[PDB]
Amino acid sequence: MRECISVHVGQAGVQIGNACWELYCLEHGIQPDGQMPSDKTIGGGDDSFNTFFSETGAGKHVPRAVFVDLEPTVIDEVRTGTYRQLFHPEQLITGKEDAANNYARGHYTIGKELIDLVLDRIRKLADQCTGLQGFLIFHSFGGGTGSGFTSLLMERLSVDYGKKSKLEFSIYPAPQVSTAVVEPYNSILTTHTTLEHSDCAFMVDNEAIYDICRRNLDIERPTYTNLNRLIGQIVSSITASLRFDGALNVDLTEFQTNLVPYPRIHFPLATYAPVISAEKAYHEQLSVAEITNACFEPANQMVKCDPRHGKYMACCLLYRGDVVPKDVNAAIATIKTKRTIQFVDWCPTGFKVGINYQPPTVVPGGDLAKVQRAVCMLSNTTAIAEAWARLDHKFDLMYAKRAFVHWYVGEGMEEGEFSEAREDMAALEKDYEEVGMDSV
């Protein structure tokens, strides 16, 4: 009745979702085969298993998610893995051939055959539930499947549903390193059909998560399973107030209105505070007044940016565990006085706090310790504009003499989308630049 729904598009969407749904079944009691843990019996009321699961007649909790991807390979690994009994096989749908890093295949010629089936699958998920509150789009900006097919899922869902909120999670193409070559093409063309068709889009860089694992954790050599656990920790803490009792719960509905000022600036960053290895957790005194001080500092960010060069508009802080409401209030008091960190001068409050009573649990195999307290920061920052400007420059290097274009335009694709995306992206930068100064 206070539930949400998620759809994962692309290989990154389902591989992150593999790490998320491990944590969702450890927070709530549900065993890997979609069952209550036996023995230990939580009873009837206790309605925390609703935001991400659906209860059948027996104790078979089925997750409220459809995993669509055009490749079979990663979906079949999920379907033959340790969670084959959890996901309903009609939710584990798959395509035929991938879009293969091609936006045209993900939107026009290969993405149009599953689009009827994925909307039918979301509609009966939406019909079965009654209290819909938001959508959780898990994908990546890099590939052609995960960014091209979600463009349909951002637009068809907006036309069919409309007023209901819908949240987006994505993987930013990395600033210094990159995975593939055609990534700057797939990154900005989706923004034309993402800007006016979304409410907020949490943007995450994987290269900064590498830097987190190197320094904040003691683990050099990170595997993708270790990277997506941090994203699973973030997506659990945004939706922690929708399922769990807290002193100051925040609903997903008022989460938008206290984060996004304007209907076009809807790109917040992410920050998880207590990313500490178990040994160093045995050492450090960890407290509220310094754990959100670690949120603001540039070396604990999730996207390559700079808080010292970028001014925040609105900050949404979400706490967990043994938090007490002055401990945030003393922490906001001591950080308003910090002359290193700058806000924009027309927003004097600039803060939303979120208080939750139950501390996070740690999945076995990870590096985090069982810390009784956690902070998730979700901040709109002007410094995302300079992360956009480098990606616009990466696109202009290829597009100067029109390279890697015949793969696109041969598959039912035009060149007007290339032209219009430049001043569309220029409209992003001029909207993010006009808030940089205050009127005296």
Partner: peptide
């Protein structure tokens, strides 16, 4: 075995009347 089509389905499969539950002895 080989993952082509419907192999989901292959691998996965390889005394009361209304009176006696409402009108019981009081």
């Amino acid at each position: 075995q080989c993952l082509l089509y419907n192999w989901e389905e292959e691998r996965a499969t390889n005394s009361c009347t209304t009176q006696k539950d409402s009108y019981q002895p009081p």
